[PDB]
Design a binder for this molecule. Structure first.
Ligand SMILES: C[C@@H](NC(C)(C)C)C(=O)c1cccc(Cl)c1
Length: 536
């Protein structure tokens, strides 16, 4: 129905600035290839696991112990990502509250936040829109670096509090009963994107942007950054690896098809990404023509690209207040939907392990939301964009790829792809097929391992638009990244130590399904013969 139209904030906010940073059309090849190779198979696998096991993300490993750390890693990654996603909803709320006027604040250089170097056009950042973004919302000119953070800005704290309160009151009494937060997330993004796409092709100088978008230069390939970014964006926008798909599938009809769900979700994700890229590059070409500069020196390459691009296109339409209000309401709805999904995933995954948290939902929800608010207090300071840049690089970078790789390895090699394909035939009626099984078993681990190894080997020091972080910010970032990657060996060691027996009865009590326990004494254990390990 309308619950398959999964359009996320990572498709409207994050894809545009990753596509512009990596050249343009030289970014869609590693994206589409990675989609085909590993996004659909893993989305299918996650949907099938969640549907069949009828449980959350951390207690879903009742089919194979020694692997519960994969759930605790994706529970922590979800937390880290919500400490910075709620600051992009606060920005949207600030812009929406500033949009209620007949003279938009991002059109003139005669305000109190304008530097005397403001040039009206009639990396830069001396334009009215960039000046507004960097000096009236962020107040970044009062910070010198990550070492000089400053105090939180009250005008953004008052917007963060509203977001936190809304999230808590939407999550405090069970899950939302559906069809309340998505009947507008489904329709509005497509209408707004269509209007922007049809309007932006008639602007002067948009042809250059379109040509730059539909042009592939191969020198940008053969470099690690494009492939790493494409893989991370796939496993950020498809929803896999965050533990949300399993929790969502845990509440569903048993015989609901997931083949069609996976195909439709992937196709719509690709279409929306392509349309967003087209619109963004058309606006970029327009601005490049207006300022008489190249298309590569006209806009920032950071996380605030849309908040400088989209207002510029809005200010050219007829009735630029109605459209601004519509666009920012759409952004707010998308952000609220994504935050609700992530927080629900966390709460369910933590309340399935322990039974004392299932009768204290108010207190637990309050705890999670208040922790998120307190930890997000760091990103609304006068130098919070640096912290947001650190967290948007190291919270789900190599760690998410490692988690997905470990989950795929675990399932396909230790539980058995034969059993995985035999319990899907038991609940749908058809056996997956050769392509899906081969894809999972051999093609997903290989490419995921290649990406992880290349990312570790070819690391690049962190920078923000000519600003170079001190050499300890990278250490802090790697410490954040390894905080979830280390939970997998630790749980294996603890589980191995906590049981009793020899090497046998310990290596085998944590590799067989929990239900299949009274066959260890009989020694009827499949994983030890070679014919388990030659699955097709
Ligand atoms: C992966 C995706 N989650 C959905 C619900 C599947 C879209 C997401 O972008 C996210 C993940 C964790 C936390 C937050 Cl706030 C957002």
């Amino acid at each position: 129905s309308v619950v398959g139209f999964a359009v996320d904030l990572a498709n409207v906010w994050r894809f545009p600035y990753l596509c512009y940073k990596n050249g343009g059309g030289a970014f869609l090849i590693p994206y589409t290839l990675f989609l085909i190779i590993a996004g659909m198979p893993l989305f299918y696998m996650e949907l099938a696991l969640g549907q069949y096991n009828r449980e959350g993300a951390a207690t879903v490993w009742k089919i194979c112990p020694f692997f519960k750390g994969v759930g605790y890693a994706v529970i922590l990654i979800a937390l880290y990502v919500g400490f910075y996603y709620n600051v992009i909803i606060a920005w949207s709320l600030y812009y929406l509250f500033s949009s209620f006027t007949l003279n938009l604040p991002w059109t003139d250089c005669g305000h109190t936040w304008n530097s005397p170097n403001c040039t009206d056009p009639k990396k830069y950042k001396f334009t009215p829109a960039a000046e507004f973004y960097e000096r009236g919302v962020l107040h970044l000119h009062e910070s010198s670096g990550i070492h000089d953070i400053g105090l939180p800005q009250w005008q953004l704290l008052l917007c963060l509090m509203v977001v936190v309160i809304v999230l808590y009151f939407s999550l405090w009494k069970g899950v939302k009963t559906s069809g309340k937060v998505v009947w507008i997330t489904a329709t509005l993004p497509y209408f707004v994107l269509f209007v922007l796409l049809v309007h932006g092709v008639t602007l002067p100088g948009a042809s250059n942007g379109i040509n730059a978008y539909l042009h592939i230069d191969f020198y940008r390939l053969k470099e690690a950054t494009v492939w790493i970014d494409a893989a991370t964006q796939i496993f950020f926008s498809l929803g896999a690896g965050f533990g949300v798909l399993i929790a969502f599938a845990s509440y569903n009809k048993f015989d609901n098809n997931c083949y069609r769900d996976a195909l439709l979700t992937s196709s719509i994700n690709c279409i929306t990404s392509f349309v967003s890229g087209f619109a963004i590059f058309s606006i970029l070409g327009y601005m490049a023509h207006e300022h008489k500069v190249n298309i590569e020196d006209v806009a920032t390459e950071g996380a605030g690209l849309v908040f400088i691009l989209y207002p510029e296109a809005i200010s050219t339409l007829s009735g630029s207040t109605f459209w601004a209000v519509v666009f920012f309401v759409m952004l707010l709805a998308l952000g609220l939907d994504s935050s609700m999904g992530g927080m629900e995933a966390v709460i369910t995954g933590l309340a399935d392990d322990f039974q004392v948290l299932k009768r204290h939902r108010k207190l637990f929800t309050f705890g999670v939301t208040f922790s998120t608010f307190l930890l997000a207090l760091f990103c609304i300071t006068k130098g919070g964009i640096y912290v947001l840049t650190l967290l948007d690089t190291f919270a789900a970078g190599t760690s998410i790829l490692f988690a997905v790789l470990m989950e795929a390895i675990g399932v396909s090699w230790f539980y058995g792809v034969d059993r995985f394909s035999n319990d899907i035939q038991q609940m749908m009626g058809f056996r997956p097929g050769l392509y899906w099984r081969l894809c999972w078993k051999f093609v997903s681990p290989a490419f995921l391992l290649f990406v992880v190894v290349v990312s570790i080997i070819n690391f690049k020091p962190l920078t923000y638009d000519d600003y170079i972080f001190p050499p300890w910010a990278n250490w802090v970032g790697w410490g954040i990244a390894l905080s979830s990657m280390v939970l997998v060996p630790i749980y294996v060691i603890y589980k191995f130590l906590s049981t009793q027996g020899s090497l046998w009865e310990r290596l085998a009590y944590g590799i067989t399904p929990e239900n299949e326990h009274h066959l260890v004494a009989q020694r009827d254990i499949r994983q030890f013969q070679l014919q388990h390990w030659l699955a097709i």
